[PDB]
Write a protein that binds this DNA or RNA. Structure first.
Ligand SMILES: [Zn+2]
Lengths: 1113, 222, 216, 170, 14, 105, 111
DNA sequence: ATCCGTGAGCGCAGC
DNA sequence: TATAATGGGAGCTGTCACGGAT
């Protein structure tokens, strides 16, 4: 399998570390590596610096320094015992009783802070998780246009979430500006008075403007002394507190000039001073110093507003979706914010515990509680919407999930307060966020992914690389610029032809502020890096993307994330050139750190020697259940004595080939209809694929049971179960647990647990029954974990945890916990779903035998048949190109790598095809065979169709068809050719998670709801199907009154009618007449609890009882 | 005293309630300012209320107090040990008569019920009670089997005389749910207990023979 | 002003933002687009109607033309309630059905006008009292036209003064909430509102429709 | 009109608002229970305070609080701030919300209900089928018609009894 | 008024 | 038709001293070609027991009458120092393709 | 008879109590230890109904022959337990409160 | 004119 | 059951169109 590579552009730089945003941020927040002394005011550090000191005002507690220890347990053991990969958090707290003068230090144990693994994930509660970066509007000050009034531009002082309320300024039609805050509007002149501004200064600042300043001129306020203005202000902000001056200053400062509650942000600050042309001394709107408040932004912000309202050039409105005004909240920022919340809650507990207790005799050990901060962080990692179950169906699953950006999540937006503007693809997204990758549905635009060569800065702003163009020459200098930065200049595209390192085009494709434009080389200043920078990884993993529509491309990229690891997985014959990188940065494929000799190789472990002589026993993963259930197993790919240099493979991971990403399999496909088995995206497969064990994967289904203490008695797990055949326990050991290596089918048992049955009076019938046969009922039940219908497989592991077992304790009330692992390898079947990298998804609808499969002239049968009608409307001609080159590969036995937008072109693919035709025909010429009469018929048809040149030799016409990607195909059922030539070739098809085995479900009768008394919902709960209003409308439209009644009573919540119906069926009886549903009775009683007398009546207008005198006294 | 399971105002109502009793007992002969003696009843009332109105399951204050000191002593361990206490550590730190069993036991009593209306999934379209079955109420399979059992059991009594069956009905409690002793059954049939006892045995045995030709009722035993 | 949005704005009897003007009374159009401002005067035999138009408004009528009452004068959408008060109910029904069909036809959707006519009929189901005559009804009280007609023929039979009434077009939502079956309305929307008003009045549901029977 | 003022508040049958024990052994209660109890706490508090006699200022606050409570029970969040049980900022469920909304009784359990004898599966194309035909997996049809087959099986000698027949199916 | 806290505060604050 | 390996219980096992898994080994054993000389034979039982650092190929196996391995150089496993290995294979001549989850020998 | 009409009307305080079988007096649920109906609780069987069919809490009566009797030792009736799904309770208040529906439903019917 | 309260697709799965 | 102790604490910010009351 030789690999050929196309391309005419060089990557001046590599693709950044894929999980850089998730690792760098969390590091820079924990600051664990940097010496506690050199640590900068960021992350958890800044949190303490803000929360502390705690002053009683007299016990005080100042922050000294914090430290992070090492985890009691390793990652693997955290997963096994359902723990959490977290570090012991300690910090230095003293308690200085100034009143006495005594200080008392004791490093306090705050709690355990979660730690992110190597890949950029976590193991919260022993389950891997990911914290999705959140996108929002950068804090700062922005000038938006009042839509109600044409020339009014309301100013908005947006602070960091939970870090101050939003402040809005607007020139009212009354001619007076107004500061709206917490839904309260008031004149700005008054606050300015508190700031110490006077009519002279105001005329110096705004007097250049028109009547605007005049409306800012309220003599009443100028006369009101600053302090008086402050009391008046408070009385306006909230009049109920007696406006005591000391209380006034408190609230005002605490909301405008308090760094402990209001913090604009380093980014917000930067944008504010570059907007106003000022400099801030801190991240505060104003500064209360020397017993007097002092503006810092209010006036320059007001200046900019007034000036924009007048018509000054230097002032302009701002785009709220521009990626220069939109920033990303990495995992680090989110963690730090939840940290500050829990740490402030603790501070409140400390502040209350230093007054009621004996202040004279207190110590930080007795003054600090570990619950607040721990619960805050526990929640942020456990039940936060941004903290989700990690995606690990395949390597790319984790990667994409960890590179996914959401504008939702707590502190974000809801799917109802989200319009098109926030969902659109802004021009700034260029090379920053992938414009094709997003969920199809209500989340579109809300959930996206990061670009490839892009990166997020410290202020949380995406940043894309651009080469420097100077005097017509180009360098390797990669200026990573932000959106607001890329707009400054003219950036030319990467594909732009260069003679060496200099422009080679009279006209150059160029982007000015994101807008397309053609200019001269001299007017060019920068240049893109490569096309790959303007797409995601999943999207970059799709060849011939320049030939696909964005909708179907979106589908392909999202579907790659759903590829199950196949035991016979293989990389695509046509690759983009990023599959190995994915495996590399996916931290799932072992590699060689430095040149060294492979000591010993084994499927359990591989030992490697190096230049220094060190011997490392690299462990391997084998049949490990994933979060999604995929059996992620690594496999060895090196032998003993092998000299692996630096960065050399040592073992393939799950769904990988030679370290290349192997999401699917390369099969032979024919694009043609087939007896409506290709109807509507459906797919036809060959039984040979199942015989070759293709599209066949291993699935680990984990089951769990726990024995717990009960008031009736302690649960115990025993093999002995009342009235349970010994064969029923055939695979169950003497304890009751299954045996490793055995198989189970629906109706079998995994673990036999017996609990104390209730003191249920023996029913009169039982009394007689029991006596008739002569047996006595036990006091233990068969609470054994049977097999869920539709599930099964081979037992691989059994873990029995019990009390008295060191390491983990059983939850209060529990006696033991036992987990069974049942794995199963399934092959493709009717109902399983396949897809490609171009969007073509379908379900297997027919598995024909090879004798029915269309076959080639040499006799090779096709593997899959794909309808040609699924291409035209979808506009994804890429699959076609993939097939053509696949055909060439199939005959030349070579794979190919095509760069996106600079890869294999029609001519080149046809040259390779020509080389194939010789291996496909010339061999025949010499094998003792010539042209088949059937081939002559197909060529006659094609000659009329204009697909071959009339007069050329039959061989030459066959070649012409081959170059077109078409070959003569015969029907194995008739032996007669297809009237026309067909497109046969190799294609990369992936097996998707969605599989009929996990979906097929049925329920005649089962669990019913507590209150509603209606069938439960869901398969795992053996629930029924929902028959909502829309389905009821269908039945009403038909006029099926009795059918509808059945679904509303007998099949629903007619507690009686349903029991009577079951009996009627088993006794060959007709079903019973439907009585009033129980839900209507629930409604009546619920309305009566609302003091509403809902009563059923009759023709005589006399009351009628649906409770049949059961609730009447 | 806020943040303990009760709102400012609820607590205030309690503190005022106690304050009236304190005013009714306050003596100016002591010469201590009202604040001094008042606080006692103000803190007691609110603290008692927190222990009386904060649990859906009423738990005695003394028990609440034990639980509180359990968490207090525990946290002390947690912060000292640099790790995380267990049933057995706290048990010894607590003192005598304190074992790991008792810790877990007390935690089991302290367990608090959760809301059935708790959200499931990020889409708030699912709730806990939706995924909780009904175990109490006759499940059509169970009720069906009981109808079948009683029918067949009767069909077995049809294989006996009414005297034999009736005797069994009363004795086993099928006649009227209530099982009637042999002396009562002999009071009904006007027969010596021994004869009643022996015919009951004869009847049971006759059922056994019929069963040895059917075994239909065994299926219900399952 | 196009697509599903337009269909919903028609079905709900909502007043369009780009609402055109229509003559209240018939007459002759007297264009008065004075260089300063544009205005139009409908000239009746002894009456005159002044309609001021934004100088930018696009008139569809010339000068000296017979503008019938309810006829469009400027381009744009028609307020259905205005047309009802001008031309009468028959017209508002025709207008609604035809405009809805316009949207559907534009997409190439084939739908028999009957269905839209059923809905429109339901939107024209209620009426307003203008004079209670010899009834307990109150001026402005809304009610079903069938009920006012029935009580009217009974009052007329005894030779009492008739109850003057006025046609009332409402949207589907309000027409549904204003039904005579509190069950159907309560199952739709505004559950609390409907329930309170029904219980206060001691309302009873005769179970004439489908929804009510489905709930039961 | 006086009936619009409430002096006797009803309480819904406890089954319709229970605190059952889950499989985990823990119990789980409806928010209605915590609402109703909240009223009782305030009511008996007021009864005692009134019976004993004490400054109006206090009684005033207490009577107001009893009002707010009743309001939360009938329609929480409608007046003031949503009543929230300690821990989560989740508003409790009031009788209104049980009757109002898509999740409310009407649009969830009255106009549309989950049904028995109903299954679900992935679909495929069946070109061989006739227009009045479908492709129903055998095992689905087994459950779907389970009782009918129990009878038919009994008519045959495939099963000794209906229970053992169903256990054969197990 | 909307804030019952502030209400008790003013009620006893007189 | 079936295969037994020493110290392995399920196909999803591992063999220390070997670069192959139980699954990959059996995948290699489907590639096996057997010749039953006597037409009245329907059954046979192959055996393979070896160790040491050597890439077992199908040359190493149990010789039997009416048993011809057309594919001798077929690689079946790679075992290095402490490369224990024991196998007992059942070969049955038949028709068509009967899935494993049907024949379960 | 057959239902042909459904009516809804305000309930009189007397009507509310006419439905109720008793009054919850204590804000309690089940036994903090035995997990059983607390007297004056919101689940007390003596009022609403027995948890189990023909089953009194004390256990003096456990048969259908006792059906329809409130055992004096326990205080629980004897019948189907489905009664707990229907039989309703009340809570008498000294001070009256207003149904928020008739107060906050514009236009307020009370106002 | 303004403000308040009302609705804003159906399943399936949701570990 | 008694040094004296007397106005709180946390705010949610990127929908919107309609019908209604004020
Ligand atoms: Zn009793």
């Amino acid at each position: 399998m030789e690999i050929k590579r196309f391309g005419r552009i060089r990557e001046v730089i590599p693709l950044p570390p894929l999980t850089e945003i998730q690792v760098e941020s969390y590091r820079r927040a924990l600051q664990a590596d940097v010496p506690p002394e050199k640590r900068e005011n960021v992350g958890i550090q800044a949190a303490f610096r803000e929360t502390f000191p705690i002053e009683e005002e007299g016990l005080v507690l100042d922050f000294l320094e914090y430290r992070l220890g090492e985890p009691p347990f390793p990652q693997d053991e955290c997963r096994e015992k359902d723990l959490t990969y977290q570090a012991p958090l300690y910090a230095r707290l003293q308690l200085i009783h100034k009143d006495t003068g005594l200080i008392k230090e004791d490093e306090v144990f705050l709690g355990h802070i979660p730690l992110m693994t190597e890949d950029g994930s976590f193991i919260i509660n022993g389950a891997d998780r990911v914290i999705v970066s959140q996108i929002h509007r950068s804090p700062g000050v922005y000038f938006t246009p009042d839509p109600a009034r044409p020339g009014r531009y309301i100013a908005s002082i947006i602070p960091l979430p939970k870090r101050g309320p939003w402040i809005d300024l607007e020139v009212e039609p009354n001619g007076v500006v107004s500061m709206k805050v917490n839904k309260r509007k008031f004149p700005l002149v008054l606050l300015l008075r508190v700031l110490g501004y006077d009519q002279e200064t105001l005329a110096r600042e705004l007097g250049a403007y028109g009547e605007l300043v005049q409306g800012l001129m309220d003599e009443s306020v100028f006369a009101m002394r600053p302090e008086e203005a402050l009391i008046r202000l408070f009385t306006l902000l909230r009049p109920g507190d007696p406006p005591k001056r000391d209380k006034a200053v408190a609230y005002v400062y605490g909301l405008i000039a308090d760094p402990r509650r209001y913090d604009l942000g380093e980014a917000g600050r930067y944008k504010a001073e570059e907007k106003l042309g000022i400099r801030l001394s801190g991240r505060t709107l104003a500064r209360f110093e020397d017993g007097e408040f002092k503006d810092e932004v209010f006036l320059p912000t007001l200046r900019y507003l007034f000036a924009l309202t007048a018509g000054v050039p230097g002032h302009e409105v701002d785009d709220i979706d521009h990626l220069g005004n939109r920033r990303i909240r990495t995992v680090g920022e989110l963690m730090t914010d939840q940290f500050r919340v829990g740490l402030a809650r603790l501070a409140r507990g400390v502040r209350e515990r230093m007054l009621m207790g004996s202040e004279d005799s207190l110590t930080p050990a007795k003054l600090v509680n570990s619950r607040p901060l721990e619960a805050a962080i526990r929640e942020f990692f456990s039940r936060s919407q941004l903290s989700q179950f990690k995606d690990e169906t395949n390597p790319l699953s984790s990667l994409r999930h960890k590179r996914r950006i959401s504008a939702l999540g707590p502190g974000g937006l809801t799917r109802e307060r989200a319009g098109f503007d926030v969902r659109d693809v802004h021009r700034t997204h260029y090379g920053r966020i992938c414009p094709v990758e997003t969920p199809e549905g209500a989340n579109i635009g809300l959930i996206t992914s990061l670009a490839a060569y892009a990166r997020v800065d410290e202020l949380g702003f995406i940043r894309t690389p651009y080469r420097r163009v100077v005097g017509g020459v180009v360098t390797d200098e990669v200026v990573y610029m932000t959106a607001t930065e890329e707009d400054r200049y003219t950036i030319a595209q990467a594909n732009t032809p260069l003679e060496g390192n200099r422009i080679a085009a009279e006209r150059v494709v160029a982007r000015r502020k994101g807008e397309p434009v053609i200019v001269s080389p001299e007017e060019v200043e920068f240049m893109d890096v490569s096309p790959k920078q303007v797409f995601s990884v999943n999207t970059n993993l799709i060849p011939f993307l320049e030939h696909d529509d964005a909708n179907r491309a979106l589908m392909g990229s999202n579907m790659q994330t759903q590829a199950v690891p196949l035991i016979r997985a293989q990389a695509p014959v046509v690759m983009t050139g990023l599959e190995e990188r994915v495996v590399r940065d996916s931290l799932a494929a072992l590699y060689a750190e430095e040149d060294g000799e492979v000591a010993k190789v084994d499927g359990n472990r591989i030992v490697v020697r190096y230049e220094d002589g060190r011997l490392v026993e690299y462990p391997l993963r084998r049949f490990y259940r994933s979060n999604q259930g995929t059996a992620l197993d690594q496999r060895p790919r090196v032998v003993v004595g092998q000299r692996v240099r630096k960065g050399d493979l040592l073992a393939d991971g799950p769904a990988s080939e030679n370290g290349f990403l192997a999401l699917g399999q390369n099969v032979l496909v024919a694009i043609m209809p087939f007896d409506g088995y290709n109807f509507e995206d459906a797919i036809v497969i060959s039984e040979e694929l199942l015989k070759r064990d293709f599209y066949t994967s291993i699935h680990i289904e984990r089951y769990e049971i726990e024995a717990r203490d009960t008031k009736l008695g302690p649960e115990r797990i025993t093999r002995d179960i009342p009235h349970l055949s010994e064969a029923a326990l055939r695979d169950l050991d003497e304890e009751g647990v299954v045996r490793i290596g055995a198989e189970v089918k629906p109706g079998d048992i995994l673990v036999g647990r017996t609990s104390f049955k209730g003191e249920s009076e023996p029913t009169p019938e039982e009394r007689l029954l029991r006596s008739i046969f002569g047996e006595k009922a036990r006091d233990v039940k068969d609470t054994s974990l049977r097999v869920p219908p539709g599930e099964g497989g081979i037992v691989v592991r059994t873990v029995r945890l019990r009390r008295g077992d060191p390491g983990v304790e059983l939850k209060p009330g529990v006696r033991e916990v036992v987990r069974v692992y049942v794995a199963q390898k399934r092959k493709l079947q009717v109902g399983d779903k396949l897809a490609n990298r171009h969007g073509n998804k379908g379900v297997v609808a027919k598995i024909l035998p090879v004798e029915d499969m269309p076959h080639l002239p040499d006799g090779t049968p096709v593997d899959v048949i794909l309808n040609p009608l699924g291409v035209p409307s979808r506009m994804n001609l890429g699959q076609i190109l993939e097939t053509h080159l696949g055909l060439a590969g199939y005959f030349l036995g070579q794979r190919y790598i095509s760069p996106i937008f600079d890869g294999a072109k029609e001519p080149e693919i046809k040259e390779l095809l020509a080389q194939a035709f010789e291996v496909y025909f010339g061999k025949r010429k010499g094998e003792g065979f010539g042209v088949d009469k059937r081939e002559v018929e197909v060529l006659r048809r094609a000659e009329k169709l204009g697909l071959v040149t009339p007069g050329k030799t039959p061989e030459e016409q066959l070649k012409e068809l081959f170059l077109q990607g078409k070959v003569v195909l015969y029907d194995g059922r008739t032996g007669e050719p297809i009237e026309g030539p067909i497109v046969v070739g190799q294609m990369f098809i992936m097996k998707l998670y969605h599989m009929v085995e996990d979906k097929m479900h049925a329920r005649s009768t089962g669990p019913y709801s507590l209150i509603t008394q209606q069938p439960l919902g869901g398969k795992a709960q053996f629930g029924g199907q929902r028959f909502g209003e829309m389905e009821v409308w269908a039945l009403e439209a038909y006029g099926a009154a009795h059918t509808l009644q059945e679904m509303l009573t007998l099949k629903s919540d007619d507690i009686e009618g349903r029991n009577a119906a079951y009996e009627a069926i088993i006794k060959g009886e007709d079903v019973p007449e439907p009585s009033v549903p129980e839900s209507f009775r629930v409604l009546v009683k619920e309305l009566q609890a609302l003091a509403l007398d809902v009563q059923t009546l009759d023709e005589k207008d006399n009351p009628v009882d649906i409770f049949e005198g059961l609730a009447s006294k | 005293y806020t943040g303990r399971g009760l709102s400012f105002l609820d607590l205030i109502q309690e503190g005022n309630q106690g304050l009236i009793r304190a005013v009714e007992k306050f003596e100016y002969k002591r010469r201590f300012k009202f604040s001094t003696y008042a606080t006692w009843w103000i803190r007691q009332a609110i603290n008692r209320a927190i222990a009386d109105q904060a649990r859906t399951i009423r738990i005695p204050v003394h028990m609440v107090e034990t639980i509180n000191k359990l968490s207090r002593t525990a946290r002390q361990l947690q912060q000292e040990l640099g790790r995380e206490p267990t049933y057995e550590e706290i048990a010894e730190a607590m003192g005598p008569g304190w074992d790991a069993k008792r810790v877990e036991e007390t935690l089991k009593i302290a367990q608090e019920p959760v809301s059935l209306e708790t959200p499931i999934g990020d889409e708030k379209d699912s709730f806990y009670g939706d995924f909780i079955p009904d175990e109490h109420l006759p499940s059509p399979v169970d009720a069906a089997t009981q109808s079948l059992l009683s029918e067949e059991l009767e069909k077995a009594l049809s294989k006996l005389s009414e005297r034999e069956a009736m005797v069994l009905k009363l004795r086993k409690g099928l006649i009227d749910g209530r099982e009637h002793t042999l002396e009562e059954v002999g009071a009904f049939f006007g027969v010596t207990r021994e004869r009643i006892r022996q015919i009951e045995n004869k009847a049971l045995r006759k059922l056994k023979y019929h069963e040895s030709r059917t075994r239909k009722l065994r299926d219900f035993l399952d | 002003t196009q697509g599903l949005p337009r269909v919903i704005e028609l079905f709900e009897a909502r007043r369009p933002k780009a609402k055109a003007v229509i003559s209240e009374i018939d007459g002759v159009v007297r264009i008065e687009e004075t260089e300063e401002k544009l205005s139009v005067f409908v000239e009746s035999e002894g009456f005159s109607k002044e309609y001021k138009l934004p100088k930018e408004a696009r008139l569809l009528v010339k000068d000296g033309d017979y503008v019938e009452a309810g006829q469009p004068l400027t381009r744009g959408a028609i307020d259905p309630h205005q047309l009802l008060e001008a031309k009468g109910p028959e017209a508002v029904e025709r207008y609604l059905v035809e405009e809805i069909q316009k949207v559907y036809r534009a997409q190439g959707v084939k739908l028999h006008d009957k269905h839209i006519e059923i809905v429109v009929r339901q939107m024209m189901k209620y009426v307003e009292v203008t004079d209670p005559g010899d009834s307990r009804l109150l001026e402005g009280q809304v009610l079903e036209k069938w009920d006012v007609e029935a009580l009217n023929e009974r009052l007329i039979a005894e030779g009492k003064t008739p109850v003057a009434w006025k046609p009332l077009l409402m949207g589907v939502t309000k027409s549904a909430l204003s039904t005579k079956s509190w069950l159907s309305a309560a199952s739709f929307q505004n559950t609390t509102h409907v329930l309170t008003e029904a219980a206060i009045a001691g309302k009873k549901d005769e179970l004439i429709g489908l929804k009510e029977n489905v709930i039961l | 009109p006086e009936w619009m003022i409430l002096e006797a508040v009803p309480v819904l049958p406890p089954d319709l608002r229970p605190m059952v024990q889950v499989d985990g052994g823990r119990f789980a209660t409806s928010d209605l229970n915590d609402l109703y109890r909240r009223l009782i706490n305030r009511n008996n508090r007021l009864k005692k305070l009134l019976a004993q006699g004490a400054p109006e200022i206090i009684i005033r606050n207490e009577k107001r609080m009893l009002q707010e409570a009743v309001d939360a029970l009938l329609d929480n969040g409608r007046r003031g701030a949503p009543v929230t049980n300690p821990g989560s900022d989740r508003p409790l469920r009031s009788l209104t919300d049980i009757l109002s909304g898509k999740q409310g009784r009407f649009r969830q359990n009255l106009l549309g209900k989950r049904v028995d004898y109903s299954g679900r599966s992935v679909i495929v194309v069946g070109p061989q089928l006739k227009l009045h035909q479908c492709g129903l997996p055998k095992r689905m049809a087994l459950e779907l018609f389970k009782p009918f087959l129990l009878k038919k099986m009994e008519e045959k000698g495939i099963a000794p009894n209906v229970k053992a027949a169903r256990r054969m199916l197990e | 008024t909307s804030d019952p806290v502030r209400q008790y505060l003013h009620e006893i604050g007189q | 038709t079936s295969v037994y390996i020493e110290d392995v219980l399920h196909e999803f096992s591992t063999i220390p001293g070997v670069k192959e898994d139980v699954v990959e080994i059996i995948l290699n054993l489907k590639e096996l070609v057997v010749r039953f000389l006597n037409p009245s034979l329907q059954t046979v039982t192959l055996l393979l027991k070896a160790e040491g650092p050597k890439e077992v190929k199908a040359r190493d196996f149990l010789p039997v009458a009416d048993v011809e391995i057309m594919n001798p150089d077929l690689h079946i496993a790679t075992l290095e120092e402490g490369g224990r290995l024991n196998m007992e294979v059942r070969v049955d001549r038949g028709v068509g393709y009967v899935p494993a989850e049907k024949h379960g020998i | 008879k057959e239902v042909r009409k459904v009516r809804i009307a305000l309930a009189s305080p007397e009507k509310i109590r006419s439905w109720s079988y008793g009054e919850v007096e204590k804000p309690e649920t089940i036994n903090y230890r035995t997990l059983k109906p607390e007297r004056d609780g919101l689940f007390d069987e003596r009022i609403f109904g027995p948890i189990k069919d023909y089953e009194c809490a004390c256990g003096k009566y456990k048969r259908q022959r006792f059906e329809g009797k409130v055992c004096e030792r326990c205080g629980v009736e004897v019948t189907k337990s489905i009664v707990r799904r229907y039989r309703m309770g009340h809570i008498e208040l000294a001070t009256p409160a207003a149904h928020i529906w008739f107060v906050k439903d514009v236009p307020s019917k009370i106002g």
